[PDB]
Amino acid sequence: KRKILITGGTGMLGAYVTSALKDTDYNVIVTERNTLNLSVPEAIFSYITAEKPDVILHFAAETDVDLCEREPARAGIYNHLATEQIAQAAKFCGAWLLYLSSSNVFGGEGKLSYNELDIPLPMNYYGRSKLIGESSVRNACTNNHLIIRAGWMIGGGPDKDHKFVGKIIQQIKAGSTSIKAVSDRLGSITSAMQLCNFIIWAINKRHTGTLHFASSGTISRFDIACAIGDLLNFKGDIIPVHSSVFPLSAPRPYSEGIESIYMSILSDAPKPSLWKSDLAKYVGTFL
Template sequence: MKIDLNKVLVTGSDGMVGSYVDFGIKTNRRSLDVTDLKEVQAVCRKYKPSAIVHLAAETDVDRCERDSEHAYMVNAVGTYHMALVAKELGIKLVYVSTAGVFDGTKKTSYTEKDIPNPTNYYGRTKHLGELAIQGMLKDYVIARVCWMFGGGPEKDQKFVAKIIKQLDGKEIKVVTDQIGSPTFGKDLVAGIKKLLKEDSRGIHNLAGKGVCSRYEFAEAIVKILGKKTKVLPVKMSDFKMDAFRTYNEGMISKISTSRHWKVALKEYLETEWK
């Protein structure tokens, strides 16, 4: 069945990824509180969406560890509410999940067939969202991503922005013992649109192509921006963090909209940060 993109309801459109959404009925945390079932039902009954793209989430890994109730309400209960309404309306639900649902012990990159085993509260709550959807719906897409970047100076609060804010100094310390597949928000939205147009179902990895360490990621940022800041290699154990970080979050993404992370990063930095 063809999905009318103009009638797709999008949650979390005021976030980093949401800033690239150029279709549908865009809602934010002020217009739609996903933790409030009555509000979710009222908004969905009002707009009668053709599908739902659920972006709203608490993605601050350390905050999830410190405030587990908040993380559970937003990531698990909020997603359950969206699945409940999607079932009630008989429409597709697209849910953006994370490589954080895995334990990071695999020697190669993760595929759609790998079994989740989250190790921190962020990963657990996102996995609970996946389970709620899989238990209630047949027409769903779980889009797993990794190491998101995008949104420019106004929206980006993740790794890229944190590195850029330190580039005026002589040196920065970045870990070498964590690898992943950096994902540009713009490419993720393109992938979601493609899956909607094709009426796809199931689990899809939408991370950027390729794998790098946080150290290599930071070095690429420094090089693209033409800075002279020295990147010093350190280990995760050198930093005190609330949440446990896994070693491997690398992903294999087969969808054609996923570009190599270096190509996407170059476009992002040159168009939104220079």
């Protein structure tokens, strides 16, 4: 009975993957605070090696970009040091390791979109911590790992989405007359449900390498808010604003847009589509 060990299983993407794995023959182990804690990297190696998993899905991370900037030690411990121990454990167990990374490894060059050939050059501590986390993974598990870079993640549905999409929908449904959205920072959206489907396919094929997974289109939060407004027949105003209006601890690049040049050779794989279409399917689940 093939074993899968999952970190961040109660996270948004993790919950989808954990649920999808229930109708399979895998023995799934969802780590908890008492068995695996990113703040205690020294206890990770012994735990994972004793479990002897065949597959490791490493989704746990410190994703508060601003907290990472104020407390780079936390970004480092949680995203770099803990990942290194997981990578060393994976290598010792001979386990295939999936590492969820981020479009934030890019931004420093200042161009509009980055593909798998672009050399990462981060703009903040979150991105740096994820980048060194990737290095740890590909050095320890060279021919047996998969690194997936996601953009701005959308997922959770009405009951669990407390991120951008859920917030914009909340404001519309509460009868707000004007909603402000940043128009001078660009990125790409990644549907968590879609990514989940891809991951299930990747586990079964034991796909390896580095891949960018995001809907096509380089857009702003303002563009996204406007699209949501159209879908819900919003009557108020969506106001485009500059970043300066909402000061934040971490610098954000002009764009963290990502596209893939390698997704198309994955013949049977579940793939993303156009951002508006993928956003519309997700927004539809709010009824």
